[PDB]
Amino acid sequence: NLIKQLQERGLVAQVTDEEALAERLAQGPIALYCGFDPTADSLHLGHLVPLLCLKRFQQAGHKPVALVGGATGLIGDPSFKAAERKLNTEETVQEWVDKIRKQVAPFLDFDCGENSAIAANNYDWFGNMNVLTFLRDIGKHFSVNQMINKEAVKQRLNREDQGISFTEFSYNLLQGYDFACLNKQYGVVLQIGGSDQWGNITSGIDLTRRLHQNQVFGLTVPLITKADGTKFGKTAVWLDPKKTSPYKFYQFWINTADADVYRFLKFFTFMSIEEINALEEEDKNSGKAPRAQYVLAEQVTRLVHGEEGLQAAKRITECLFSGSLSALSEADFEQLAQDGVPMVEMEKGADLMQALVDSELQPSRGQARKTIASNAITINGEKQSDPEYFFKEEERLFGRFTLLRRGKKNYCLICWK
Amino acid sequence: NLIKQLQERGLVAQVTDEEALAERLAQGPIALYCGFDPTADSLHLGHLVPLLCLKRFQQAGHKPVALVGGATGLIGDPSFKAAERKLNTEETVQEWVDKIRKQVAPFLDFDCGENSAIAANNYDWFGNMNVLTFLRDIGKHFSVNQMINKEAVKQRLNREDQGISFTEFSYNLLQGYDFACLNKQYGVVLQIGGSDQWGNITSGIDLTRRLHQNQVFGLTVPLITKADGTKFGKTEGGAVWLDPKKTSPYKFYQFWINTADADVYRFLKFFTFMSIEEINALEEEPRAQYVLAEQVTRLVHGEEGLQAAKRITECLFSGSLSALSEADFEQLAQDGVPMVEMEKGADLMQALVDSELQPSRGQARKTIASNAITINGEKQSDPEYFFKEEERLFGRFTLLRRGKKNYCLICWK
Numbered sequence: 001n002l003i004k005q006l007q008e009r010g011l012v013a014q015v016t017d018e019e020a021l022a023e024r025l026a027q028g029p030i031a032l033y034c035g036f037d038p039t040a041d042s043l044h045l046g047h048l049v050p051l052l053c054l055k056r057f058q059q060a061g062h063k064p065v066a067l068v069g070g071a072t073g074l075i076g077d078p079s080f081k082a083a084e085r086k087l088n089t090e091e092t093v094q095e096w097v098d099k100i101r102k103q104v105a106p107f108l109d110f111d112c113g114e115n116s117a118i119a120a121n122n123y124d125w126f127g128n129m130n131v132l133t134f135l136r137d138i139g140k141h142f143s144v145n146q147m148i149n150k151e152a153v154k155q156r157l158n159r160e161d162q163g164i165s166f167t168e169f170s171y172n173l174l175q176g177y178d179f180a181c182l183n184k185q186y187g188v189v190l191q192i193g194g195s196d197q198w199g200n201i202t203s204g205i206d207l208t209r210r211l212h213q214n215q216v217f218g219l220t221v222p223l224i225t226k227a228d229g230t231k232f233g234k235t236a237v238w239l240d241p242k243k244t245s246p247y248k249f250y251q252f253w254i255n256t257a258d259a260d261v262y263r264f265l266k267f268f269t270f271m272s273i274e275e276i277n278a279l280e281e282e283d284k285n286s287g288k289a290p291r292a293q294y295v296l297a298e299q300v301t302r303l304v305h306g307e308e309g310l311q312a313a314k315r316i317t318e319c320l321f322s323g324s325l326s327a328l329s330e331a332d333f334e335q336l337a338q339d340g341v342p343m344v345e346m347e348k349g350a351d352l353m354q355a356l357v358d359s360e361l362q363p364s365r366g367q368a369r370k371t372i373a374s375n376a377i378t379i380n381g382e383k384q385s386d387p388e389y390f391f392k393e394e395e396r397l398f399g400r401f402t403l404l405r406r407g408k409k410n411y412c413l414i415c416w417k
Numbered sequence: 418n419l420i421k422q423l424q425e426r427g428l429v430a431q432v433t434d435e436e437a438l439a440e441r442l443a444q445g446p447i448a449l450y451c452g453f454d455p456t457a458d459s460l461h462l463g464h465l466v467p468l469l470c471l472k473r474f475q476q477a478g479h480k481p482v483a484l485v486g487g488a489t490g491l492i493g494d495p496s497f498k499a500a501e502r503k504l505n506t507e508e509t510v511q512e513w514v515d516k517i518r519k520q521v522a523p524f525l526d527f528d529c530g531e532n533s534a535i536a537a538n539n540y541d542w543f544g545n546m547n548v549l550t551f552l553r554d555i556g557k558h559f560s561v562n563q564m565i566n567k568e569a570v571k572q573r574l575n576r577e578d579q580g581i582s583f584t585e586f587s588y589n590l591l592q593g594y595d596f597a598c599l600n601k602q603y604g605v606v607l608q609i610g611g612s613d614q615w616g617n618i619t620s621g622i623d624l625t626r627r628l629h630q631n632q633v634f635g636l637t638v639p640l641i642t643k644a645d646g647t648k649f650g651k652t653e654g655g656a657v658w659l660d661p662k663k664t665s666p667y668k669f670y671q672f673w674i675n676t677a678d679a680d681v682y683r684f685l686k687f688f689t690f691m692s693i694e695e696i697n698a699l700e701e702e703p704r705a706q707y708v709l710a711e712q713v714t715r716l717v718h719g720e721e722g723l724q725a726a727k728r729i730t731e732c733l734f735s736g737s738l739s740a741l742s743e744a745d746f747e748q749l750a751q752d753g754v755p756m757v758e759m760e761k762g763a764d765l766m767q768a769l770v771d772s773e774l775q776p777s778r779g780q781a782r783k784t785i786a787s788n789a790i791t792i793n794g795e796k797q798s799d800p801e802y803f804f805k806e807e808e809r810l811f812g813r814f815t816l817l818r819r820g821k822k823n824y825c826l827i828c829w830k
């Protein structure tokens with residue numbers, strides 16, 4: 001029972017007619033879908049949970065359809081968003097569409113027979129639909145009375161100053177129609193998404209019933225919450241390495257709290273529930289701190305960034321920890337400059353004293369002198385006690401980088417020129 | 418000032434930026450519009466007041482655009498309507514568009530130089546507009562918070578069972594964009610309509626600022642009211658239509674004759690081109706109901722229509738029918754007097770029973786014997802009487818009267 005398995009991982013927030021759906025799943029393979037709107041040039045961890053759920057359905061023999069919102073990204077989903085978003089250009093949305101389609105593709109199997117993945121784009125049907133056709137054939141089935149009371153938009157109707165345009169208000173109908181379209185095109189009978197998408201999903205179930213007279217289902221995945229109450233992925237943790245480096249991504253998982261690590265293994269990895277429970281039991285019964293954060297970091301970094309990406313994240317982690325930077329490549333230093341450690345700009349010939357001031361590692365030049373004399377500053381992991389020390393020509397790695405460290409953990413990469 | 422002249426006729430319910438509109442009108446000809454949606458095969462008396470206002474503006478040198486809602490008629494205006502309307506088909510709406518366009522045309526001048534009237538149809542811009550273009554280019558300028566606060570839809574936003582669909586809720590944007598579209602195509606700077614249209618007009622004014630950076634104005638006419646509080650133009654038969662096949666010229670003329678004294682002077686101002694000074698002079702007296710009937714019947718049905726209405730009224734008052742044509746008896750059969758279809762050979766007693774002028778043959782006999790019945794205006798007091806063939810006028814009609822006023826037209830099969 002796939003639904004029961006997903007429930008056991010904590011991956012089911014809500015599900016329409018659970019018995020009929022589980023009966024349909026047990027009968028044989030179904031076609032299902034999840035949509036992703038292009039509101040940026042990359043997906044982030046928030047999007048990864050339902051994307052991996054598409055893969056979990058596919059592993060059970062079901063056929064996943066990953067829709068990219070070519071049309072809906074030109075409209076804007078207001079679902080649980082406090083403010084109206086500016087419209088993006090057709091040109092920008094198209095660029096993002098191609099980037100998101102290409103980022104999604106490696107997470108699903110496009111070559112496993114009858115249940116092979118499908119890439120879809122709702123611009124295929126909205127790009128040539130007339131307004132009167134939309135208002136009549138689709139709009140007649142929506143009650144504004146019900147629409148204005150939906151949890152996803154109700155708060156936007158409290159104050160006109162923090163209101164909702166007719167454009168964003170119409171979004172719910174567009175997503176509704178997509179479900180009817182995919183049902184007609186591929187026999188899609190299930191739509192999945194994060195919990196904020198419930199209302200957009202249920203509109204699609206109801207519309208499919210009115211237009212195609214078919215029974216379809218919805219299933220939502222919970223929005224990720226931390227046990228301490230703070231906002232998840234607040235450092236967004238992007239999937240694109242040029243937005244969030246494999247090193248920053250790996251470190252994000254390493255620093256998961258003990259209260260979140262087992263839930264996160266369930267949500268973000270393909271480890272069996274038995275292996276995750278064995279790992280939790282081992283951490284519970286070992287007289288030591290948990291090791292689960294290391295397993296989670298390895299699993300998700302390999303999944304998103306491959307073995308190359310995981311090996312770079314570990315190599316960088318190792319070199320920063322050990323102090324020895326000889327193993328680091330220029331590409332590894334580029335990850336550090338991007339987002340791995342705080343970084344600053346400085347011209348070659350600088351004394352160790354002045355490097356510490358602009359990096360915000362020291363308040364003044366007078367303080368810098370005593371901190372060097374106390375043998376508290378390292379240059380590329382080598383202890384340097386001389387206050388009057390100037391960096392050697394071999395110390396500027398790839399003629400552009402030097403890693404400053406004050407104490408055990410305060411870093412600043414200097415990007416030379 | 419044309420605005421002040423409309424105000425003294427009581428034709429101004431609301432007007433936007435009034436001092437600026439008055440100054441724009443005084444400077445020279447403007448282009449203005451009023452829209453009419455196809456929800457029937459004919460307009461009715463409710464549509465006449467804004468239609469005549471387009472003519473009032475054209476007489477002052479302005480250029481009227483009479484819009485027929487080929488696209489909006491496929492959507493449905495919910496403004497101050499208690500319930501959701503069923504959608505009409507594209508084929509039905511198109512038939513009605515052509516009928517309404519043809520009905521409107523004689524009221525305006527399409528051949529008077531620069532200010533010649535224009536027939537417009539919003540299907541010309543919405544019939545092919547892409548949904549994403551409409552949602553982005555138009556819908557982004559509309560606040561749902563403002564829309565739900567429009568007076569026209571407040572009664573529909575409290576209970577789902579007396580609710581509003583997304584289709585009817587979008588209507589306000591279509592009418593809003595028509596004003597922007599006409600401003601761009603023709604330099605239209607004013608929209609007029611009944612007072613129920615205020616919210617739809619103001620959305621168009623706002624949208625025109627947002628889209629074209631142009632200042633445009635709105636003016637509404639009051640919804641015609643009756644002093645006694647009852648609905649205007651609601652007769653026993655229903656609405657008072659402009660189409661003579663729905664409401665005969667005679668029935669039309671009689672509706673106006675029977676206007677209450679408390680309404681007649683106000684109605685002369687709304688429905689006629691008589692000067693305000695003459696109406697006020699007429700009030701000093703009444704001839705007003707006859708003047709109102711003559712003016713509005715001539716305006717809607719022409720001189721022929723008015724003459725037919727007067728000739729029928731006179732023949733029915735006098736009982737003398739020789740002046741009636743077969744077309745006049747057709748008006749009587751349609752809606753002029755009660756009518757009954759009968760097989761030839763029926764006796765006078767049976768015609769009285771079948772027409773419900775009498776409850777039984779026995780009673781009919783006494784009523785005939787009492788000299789209460791006329792056949793084509795001639796007394797017939799023989800209770801055993803059978804109609805003569807010559808009494809079937811045009812081989813088809815025989816008008817019966819019981820007492821001095823109860824008519825029934827027999828239409829022979």
Ligand SMILES: Nc1ccn([C@@H]2O[C@H](COS(=O)(=O)NC(=O)[C@@H](N)Cc3ccc(O)cc3)[C@@H](O)[C@H]2O)c(=O)n1
Pocket residue numbers: 034035036037038045046047048049050067069072077122174175176178179192193194195196197200222223224
């Ligand atoms: N922090 C977050 C952010 C997003 N998500 C989930 O990720 C998925 C993609 O997020 S999204 O791109 O913002 N999605 C939307 O805006 C959806 N309206 C996209 C869409 C769905 C179906 C369709 O027919 C057309 C379009 C959705 O299922 C969200 O619920 C999430 O789970 N947690």
Ligand SMILES: Nc1ccn([C@@H]2O[C@H](COS(=O)(=O)NC(=O)[C@@H](N)Cc3ccc(O)cc3)[C@@H](O)[C@H]2O)c(=O)n1
Pocket residue numbers: 451452453454455463464465466467484486489494539591592593595596609610611612613614617639640641
């Ligand atoms: N009893 C009545 C009935 C109608 N009217 C007035 O007659 C005019 C036509 O009536 S109507 O056909 O119901 N009008 C509508 O539905 C308008 N929404 C038609 C319309 C206007 C502008 C536009 O760009 C597109 C469409 C409108 O101005 C009404 O306010 C009136 O004054 N009294």
Ligand SMILES: [Cl-]
Pocket residue numbers: 761762763803804805806
């Ligand atoms: Cl006879």
